[PDB]
Amino acid sequence: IEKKIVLRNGTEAFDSWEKPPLPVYTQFYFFNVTNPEEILRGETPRVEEVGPYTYRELRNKANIQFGDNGTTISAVSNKAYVFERDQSVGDPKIDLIRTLNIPVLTVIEWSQVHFLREIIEAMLKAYQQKLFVTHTVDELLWGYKDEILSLIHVFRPDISPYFGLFYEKNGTNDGDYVFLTGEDSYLNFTKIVEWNGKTSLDWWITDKCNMINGTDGDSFHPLITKDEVLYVFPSDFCRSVYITFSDYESVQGLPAFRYKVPAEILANTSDNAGFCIPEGNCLGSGVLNVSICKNGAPIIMSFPHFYQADERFVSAIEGMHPNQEDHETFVDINPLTGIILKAAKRFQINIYVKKLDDFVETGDIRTMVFPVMYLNESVHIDKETASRLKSMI
Ligand SMILES: *[C@@H]1O[C@H](CO)[C@@H](O[C@@H]2O[C@H](CO)[C@@H](O[C@@H]3O[C@H](CO)[C@@H](O)[C@H](O[C@H]4O[C@H](CO)[C@@H](O)[C@H](O)[C@@H]4O[C@@H]4O[C@H](CO)[C@@H](O)[C@H](O)[C@H]4NC(C)=O)[C@@H]3O)[C@H](O)[C@H]2NC(C)=O)[C@H](O)[C@H]1NC(C)=O
Ligand SMILES: *[C@@H]1O[C@H](CO)[C@@H](O[C@@H]2O[C@H](CO)[C@@H](O[C@@H]3O[C@H](CO)[C@@H](O)[C@H](O[C@H]4O[C@H](CO)[C@@H](O)[C@H](O)[C@@H]4O)[C@@H]3O)[C@H](O)[C@H]2NC(C)=O)[C@H](O)[C@H]1NC(C)=O
Ligand SMILES: *[C@@H]1O[C@H](CO)[C@@H](O[C@@H]2O[C@H](CO)[C@@H](O[C@@H]3O[C@H](CO)[C@@H](O)[C@H](O)[C@@H]3O)[C@H](O)[C@H]2NC(C)=O)[C@H](O)[C@H]1NC(C)=O
Ligand SMILES: *[C@@H]1O[C@H](CO)[C@@H](O[C@@H]2O[C@H](CO)[C@@H](O)[C@H](O)[C@H]2NC(C)=O)[C@H](O)[C@H]1NC(C)=O
Ligand SMILES: *[C@@H]1O[C@H](CO)[C@@H](O[C@@H]2O[C@H](CO)[C@@H](O)[C@H](O)[C@H]2NC(C)=O)[C@H](O)[C@H]1NC(C)=O
Ligand SMILES: *[C@@H]1O[C@H](CO)[C@@H](O)[C@H](O)[C@H]1NC(C)=O
Ligand SMILES: *[C@@H]1O[C@H](CO)[C@@H](O)[C@H](O)[C@H]1NC(C)=O
């Protein structure tokens, strides 16, 4: 039967859930701020966009121990990145990107205390710290030592000196999971239950919001059918998300189910309500306040070029051009096995920024959600393993 797919030792199904066959590609795109001065003086930001910077991923999920008479399994998804100079636009070490200096933006919200605002302000004046800063693509991505964080270490050592969009994340995991193997049913295959032992999320408001649904996102149960809707829990995005059925496609050799990410997921609605930390005050349709799970930094997740978000957002930054073709997030699954064939995962990263009279560095700047960069986590199935799947099916 089609019940050949479960996590059990040695089986072809489980086999590659350990080391997957697929050359997954992550591509970074940065927003270069071309009129930083005027941004401060109060104009509308003008950005240019540089990318792709393409890394190839190495995925191995280790630290495995089974349990509960064979119905559960625990591991960590481990992930690393290899830079390809040919398939990227330029060299991440050579090329420069001018953009927000987040450590200062962060230590500014990190100060909720009046004497802290006072003192932490003194720092920026004396150290000659500006709001907009120029770094190398490699630096922003991976790490650079900031003059400001360097100090905070000498005081409050728990805080790391370095900063990078991904810092200390090359070769590490997104945390320790436990997946329900497909024994108890074919439906609960590679579904998630306990993440760091947390059987629900702590930091949203409503229980619905806090809940953990669906797979890790690299796979689904067999018999995916046109009507039914799929749940996914990407870690870096901080919430449980779901996809809907679009249409029938053929990718490489196989039949496929096109699944996009529907609008009702990121909008202002009674269902999505509990994701607004200000007790029911929402930022708008199409963005997320991730500032809780990002350590308290002013971070806003969104879709590339604000796609699916209230036009009032696309309006705030000139140089934004969302189109469904480039900026959506689809996935193409095999309706029988629940295997992912053609998939492109695209989300953005923004810093919430507004004027502050206490801090001279923020100047007259507009109150807005300000984009730093976005990425495409893609994948494509080659010819060699297309036949092998056509075989097994
Ligand atoms: C990861 O995510 C990013 C997106 O965020 C992807 O990068 C994008 O890739 C797109 C294509 O995959 C690029 O889009 C192209 O942009 C060109 C101009 O910049 C434009 O000329 C292209 O338009 C053609 O393709 C369309 C189909 O997409 C057609 O409808 C259109 O008419 C053009 O197609 C040709 O048309 C002529 C007639 O005019 C025909 O004679 C040709 O035969 C047609 N050829 C084809 C193939 O149709 C297209 O819009 C986009 O620029 C790029 N953006 C960035 C920022 O990188 C990544 O690819 C994605 N995944 C991976 C794995 O990289
Ligand atoms: C993102 O935007 C930023 C800001 O606009 C941009 O940074 C700038 O990059 C240029 C090069 O592309 C840097 O210009 C250099 O500056 C040094 C002095 O600081 C000069 O010595 C250099 O002179 C050369 O210029 C010509 C070649 O470019 C030659 O004719 C000449 O003989 C020299 O070889 C050069 O002008 C500039 O310093 C930065 N600006 C800042 C503030 O860092 C960045 O390049 C953009 N990124 C992308 C990917 O487009
Ligand atoms: C995104 O979410 C963050 C939380 O992660 C929001 O920050 C929170 O803002 C509220 C104000 O609505 C703060 O509440 C008040 O703080 C003061 C000072 O401590 C206190 O005396 C009041 O009683 C009240 O609790 C709250 O402190 C703050 N939370 C954190 C963790 O900083 C933020 O406003 C959201 N961003 C946007 C753009 O909406
Ligand atoms: C992330 O770490 C990996 C693994 O350490 C790096 O990839 C490899 O390791 C060294 C790096 O100097 C070199 O042998 C090659 O670059 C890689 N070899 C193999 C076999 O993969 C990778 O460079 C790191 N990525 C970043 C952006 O730092
Ligand atoms: C997590 O999963 C549950 C069930 O899949 C989602 O709650 C369902 O929501 C729909 C529409 O909101 C209702 O028609 C169902 O009755 C609900 N079922 C249950 C069991 O609650 C919940 O929305 C999901 N949460 C997130 C954050 O995705
Ligand atoms: C697994 O799916 C079946 C199908 O409805 C359900 O009976 C069972 O409760 C699911 N597992 C858990 C832990 O709920
Ligand atoms: C979101 O919608 C609710 C009513 O559905 C409204 O009370 C709230 O103020 C809205 N928030 C925004 C940011 O539009």
Residue numbers in the entry: 37 to 429
Q: Can you list sentences taken from the study reporting this PDB entry?
A:
SCARB2 is responsible for attachment as well as uncoating of EV71. SCARB2 is ubiquitously expressed and serves as a common receptor for all clinically isolated EV71 strains, CVA16, CVA7 and CVA14. SCARB2 (residues 37–430) consists of three domains arranged in a “Kidney” shape.
To gain an understanding of the molecular basis of SCARB2-mediated uncoating of EV71 under acidic conditions, we solved the crystal structures of the ectodomain of SCARB2 under both neutral (pH 7.5) (hereafter denoted as nSCARB2) and acidic conditions (pH 4.8) (hereafter denoted as aSCARB2). The structure of aSCARB2 reveals a penetrable tunnel, which traverses the entire length of the molecule. In contrast, under acidic conditions, we propose that an alteration in the protonation state of H150 triggers the re-arrangement of the linker region connecting α4 with α5 such that the linker is now part of α5. More importantly, α5 moves towards α15 and together with the conformational change of W146, extends the lipid-transfer tunnel right through to the membrane-distal end of the molecule with an open entrance. Additional electrostatic interactions between H150 and K161 of α5 and D394 and E397 of α15 further assist in the movement of α5. When exposed to acid pH in the late endo/lyso-somes, the cap undergoes conformational changes that lead to the opening of the lipid-transfer tunnel.
